[PDB]
Amino acid sequence: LLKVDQEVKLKVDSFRERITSEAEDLVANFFPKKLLELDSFLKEPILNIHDLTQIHSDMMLKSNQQLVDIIEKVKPEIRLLIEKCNTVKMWVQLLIPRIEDGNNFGVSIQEETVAELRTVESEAASYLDQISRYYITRAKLASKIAKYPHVEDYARTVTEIDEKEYISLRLIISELRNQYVTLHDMILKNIEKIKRPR
Amino acid sequence: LLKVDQEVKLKVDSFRERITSEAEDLVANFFPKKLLELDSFLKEPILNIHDLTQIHSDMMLKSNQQLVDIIEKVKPEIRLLIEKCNTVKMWVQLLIPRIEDGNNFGVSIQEETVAELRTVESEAASYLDQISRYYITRAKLASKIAKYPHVEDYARTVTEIDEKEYISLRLIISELRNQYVTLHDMILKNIEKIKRPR
Amino acid sequence: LLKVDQEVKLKVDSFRERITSEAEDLVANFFPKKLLELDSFLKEPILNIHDLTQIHSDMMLKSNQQLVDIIEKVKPEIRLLIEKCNTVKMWVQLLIPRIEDGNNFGVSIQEETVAELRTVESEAASYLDQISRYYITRAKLASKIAKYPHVEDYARTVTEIDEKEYISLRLIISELRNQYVTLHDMILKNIEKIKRPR
Amino acid sequence: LLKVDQEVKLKVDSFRERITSEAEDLVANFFPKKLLELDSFLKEPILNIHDLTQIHSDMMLKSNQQLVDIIEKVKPEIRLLIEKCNTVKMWVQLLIPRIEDGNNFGVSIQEETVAELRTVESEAASYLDQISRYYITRAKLASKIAKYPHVEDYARTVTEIDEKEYISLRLIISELRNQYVTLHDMILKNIEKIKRPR
Amino acid sequence: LLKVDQEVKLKVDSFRERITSEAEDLVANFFPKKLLELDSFLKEPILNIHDLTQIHSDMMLKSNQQLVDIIEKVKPEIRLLIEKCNTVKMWVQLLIPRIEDGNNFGVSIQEETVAELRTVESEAASYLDQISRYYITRAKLASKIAKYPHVEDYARTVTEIDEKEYISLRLIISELRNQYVTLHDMILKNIEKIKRPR
Amino acid sequence: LLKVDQEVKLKVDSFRERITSEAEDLVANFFPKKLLELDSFLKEPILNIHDLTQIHSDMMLKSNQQLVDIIEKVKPEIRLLIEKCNTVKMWVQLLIPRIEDGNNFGVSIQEETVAELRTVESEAASYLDQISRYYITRAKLASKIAKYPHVEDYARTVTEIDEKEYISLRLIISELRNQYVTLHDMILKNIEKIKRPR
Amino acid sequence: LLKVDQEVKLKVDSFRERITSEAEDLVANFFPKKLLELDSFLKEPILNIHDLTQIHSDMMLKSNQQLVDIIEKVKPEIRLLIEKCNTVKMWVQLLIPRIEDGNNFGVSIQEETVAELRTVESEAASYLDQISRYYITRAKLASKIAKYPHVEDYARTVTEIDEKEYISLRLIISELRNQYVTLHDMILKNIEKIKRPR
């Protein structure tokens, strides 16, 4: 064993408690409330447009406002899952016990929970990257529309990128709603083994 | 266990019921009706042209309107599988039980069902990317036909891309019809274990 | 179980029978007739040229018309295998039974058959891509022959690409004939287990 | 055995003791104090800005100074984990015993600890690379904003990169804090087998 | 079972007999004679030049005649192995029996034989690609010797590529000779199980 | 067995004895002396600069002298480990016995030791590549600072590369010291089985 | 079995005997003599220069003669290992017996010997590619030194590539010597099972 100073140890123990209280309130209060808010956004008219010709913008020059406005609403939700998933993962990580030869089935559930939260955080970060990739790809296609006015397929590439972003951003909002419901159910179904592994 | 507020819990239970009702009607009613519509599209003349020299457009400048018209009908069908597959996957996920050492054969069927729905949803998204890649590739080749008028293989590259897109778009419509029938049969054959795993 | 409307169910059952009837005739009557036609093409003089200096075109400018003429014959055959393999794969997929703990040896033969048909369909689609890559690569090499008239190796690169495409297109016709005979023998040597898995 | 000079052996033993002393203080005193400092930074206002439009710089030309100031604070903390993790890994490596057929469960804990410390050191080095990629990518986008003033998406690409860097730097400060608490708990829980494997 | 037309079946059986006769004569007569011809080429002076400075061409402009002449002899031999290996692979493939739970050791030898022939046919096709890559790389290096006359290393890159091609082409003639002897020995040693698997 | 000429055998035996003597002195006397020298360099002021803004050079034009001076000291130490690790690997490789069915636990230690030395020798060679990548990356960024004088992120990219190189070169010196102590401990602990495997 | 013509069979048997005699003389006379010649080269002054600033050439324009002179000696030695390893691999391949269910331990030693010789022959071919990459990389860096005279790091990149090539060429000469001694010991230690597997 290595000796640890008591005054710092008491401050570390208060951090471990605060992380425990937040992770439990996030799983049992925030994850359920956030699922209801994200479900309500998907029932709004902006995210349910049948003719995708409506979302098209005339074009080099301007950026799609109908997409810029939806992205501005989606980006705050992706940032909240990444932050809240990190607090929940740390809580499960600090409940994993001393490595021992037997009674390691509960530890596997705790290790499976930490691996799911790492997948959710990585998928959420990819969604933020896809929004940046849309702006760079539309920006390049706009430069090519001006450089080669004769080719009509350059213009069709901008309309295709805009329509695919509308489908992709609506799918990201459905996936964020699905991740909050899936993580709440799994953590609550497997709570006794996650809280008390052995 | 972590305590959950009852009023928000009652709202979460209504979401879980709505997702169950929709997923059951999509597998039982929509998936079979969509298979009949996609099979009817494949017997229409626009998708059954023996001489692919009739799909050719003279060319920089214009974009094939025989292909732009088919892509316009294919893209709405690809978007419906991605959205409907996501609702059915969530229904199976919310049925997966507390992790336990034994009686996990039914859980495997529920986990195999979610893995197939993820493969179907990823393949459908790839089909939408392929339509965008056609427009960028034809656009680049159209720019080269103008830059190098002398090379006659630049023109043959545009005729080849148009013929490969026609064969590819008909294969996407047949694959989308195959995914609706294959997913209906598997979910209906394996329903008792998916609904009641243990 | 989920209830299914009877009138649509009768229509789904009629589709399942048509896919069964077509798939049985393709394995039994079309795969054997197509092997005999593809074998006869390989004995025609155009696909059996010993001196490969006779398939050479003088060159920027023109595209080989000895190669363009063979590609025009090879491309329709690659398209027929992709469409017919898709109908046979679906017939086998609709015969795979409810997942159960035992008696899964026949299911493995049905799953192994679907995996072979997926490999044949992917290899056939790759062959269509190889023909498009020939045109883009020859087109670029032709642009370089005009940009750098001094380098003698740019011209040798065009003669090499034309000779390799002749060897490659003849290998594709042999591989397509081999896939028809191989799929016919495996499907009718393993029919009893594929039709009746358990 | 190979004979080793005693005077150099005495000096190697003092190095081996100094590394043991430092690693034990780093795990029991520094790792806990650093978690407390990194948690306090996350509660400071600079890292808690709700409207991410307040971190936007007007733009070619100038670099974000709200981001340059945070990177100047984040980069020293990443450098301390990489150096301190290397001292702790060497201590665990020098406790691994002579390879023997049995009683190798504790050696697995020591080998698992060295693998976690190698993962922490690699992840920390990646975070330093991500800060360099932000500057090169913003520099390139700034050059394109000057080259193509007409395209409005080039400007949106810079605001998007600045907002993603703010979210990423707050995540690096949280991950660095999480690595100090995770490594302190694992090494202290598993100390008896890490110090005395057999 | 599926019924097959007798007249088309009789023609399919004649094809299977012709493939069997050719594959048996290729393994027993052609593979041994080809190994003797390829061994005789390797003892000729053209492929046994000690001073590799003698195979150098002065250079943009001219391509190496000494190497163009050897590639002209090597390329026909690579084409014969690819075509003849395809006939031998099909004969072994048409001998693989109905899938059964036991007595599957001979089937493994037949499957190992088809996998080796697929490796030989793929390695041979790569050798044809390597010859095309030499011409494109020498062409690019020749364009750079003219663009940057001052840099002496551009000239040394052409002499190095020519010497490496001489070594590579002699290794390809030895590998083609080694594939003929290796495939003859394995197929004759393992014939009883390949011809009669069970 | 194959007969070997005695006079050449006696000379081969003298080589194997000389390699054995060197490998034993290198593990017993040089690995320990080199670890003390590399540890002393890490306590020197040049490798321990807290303000990393003191290692910054004004900038196209000049290269960082503070970094050039350290790379000149680091590169000789990386070269000595690569050369000495090769003599120690050959000594262990030439002690591996005739392949036999049993008593292969000691051979595994000898095979595991040769694999660690291959990892050290490959990692050390990578460090020499990283020093070359610094010069090419700083050189490209310096070309861009002159081409695009307006963008201030190009200048921040050079200061960042210089700071990451200082952190990296101090990490290479600590890793080289750690490899000498780790290799000496493992080879000396596992000596009886490495020298006499069975 | 397939009948084989006796006269061609007698000629194949003489080829098989010639490969056996050559392979046994290479393992027992050439491999030992080549290890001694390559060890003597490593003790010559040209490959043992302490100050690597003495191998530097002033520079666009000239190529390093001190390196062109060492590469001219190293390249003939890499070529001999590739050709001689191919003769030894074929001898071991032609001794591998008919596949049988049991008594397959010796076949594993013969299969391990063919795999080692394939790794040695692939590594040697890569060393020849590395000599070509030095020339193309030095040539490109020399072109950039003339294009951007202001950037001093372009010049430091040529001095670094030259010093790394000197270290790499001495490492290739030691690796070629190590491969001759390692292959002689493994083949002579494991000869009885390689010559008579069962």
UniProtKB/Swiss-Prot annotation, chains A, B, C, D, E, F, G:
Its main location: nucleus. Signal peptide: none annotated. The keyword Zinc does not apply. The modification Phosphoserine is found at residues 14, 21. InterPro entries: PA28_C (IPR003186), PA28_C_sf (IPR036997), PA28_N_sf (IPR036996), Proteasome_activ_PA28 (IPR009077), Proteasome_activ_PA28_N (IPR003185), Proteasome_activ_sf (IPR036252). GO terms for molecular function: endopeptidase activator activity; identical protein binding; MDM2/MDM4 family protein binding; p53 binding. GO terms for cellular component: ciliary basal body; cilium; cytoplasm; cytosol; membrane; nucleoplasm; nucleus; proteasome activator complex. Keywords: Acetylation, Apoptosis, Cell cycle, Cytoplasm, Host-virus interaction, Nucleus, Phosphoprotein, Proteasome. The keyword DNA-binding does not apply. Induction: Up-regulated in thyroid carcinoma cells. GO terms for biological process: apoptotic process; negative regulation of extrinsic apoptotic signaling pathway; regulation of G1/S transition of mitotic cell cycle; regulation of proteasomal protein catabolic process. Phosphorylated by MAP3K3. Belongs to the PA28 family. Subunit of the 11S REG-gamma (also called PA28-gamma) proteasome regulator, a doughnut-shaped homoheptamer which associates with the proteasome. 11S REG-gamma activates the trypsin-like catalytic subunit of the proteasome but inhibits the chymotrypsin-like and postglutamyl-preferring (PGPH) subunits. Facilitates the MDM2-p53/TP53 interaction which promotes ubiquitination- and MDM2-dependent proteasomal degradation of p53/TP53, limiting its accumulation and resulting in inhibited apoptosis after DNA damage. May also be involved in cell cycle regulation. Homoheptamer; the stability of the heptamer is essential for the specific activation of the trypsine-like subunit and inhibition of the chymotrypsin-like and postglutamyl-preferring (PGPH) subunits of the proteasome. Interacts with p53/TP53 and MDM2. Interacts with MAP3K3. Associates with the proteasome. Interacts with CCAR2. Interacts with PSME3IP1 (via C-terminus); the interaction is direct and promotes the association of PSME3 with the 20S proteasome. Interacts with COIL; the interaction is inhibited by PSME3IP1. (Microbial infection) Interacts with human cytomegalovirus UL27. The C-terminal sequences affect heptamer stability and proteasome affinity. This is Proteasome activator complex subunit 3. It comes from Homo sapiens. The lineage of its organism: Eukaryota, Metazoa, Chordata, Craniata, Vertebrata. The gene is PSME3.
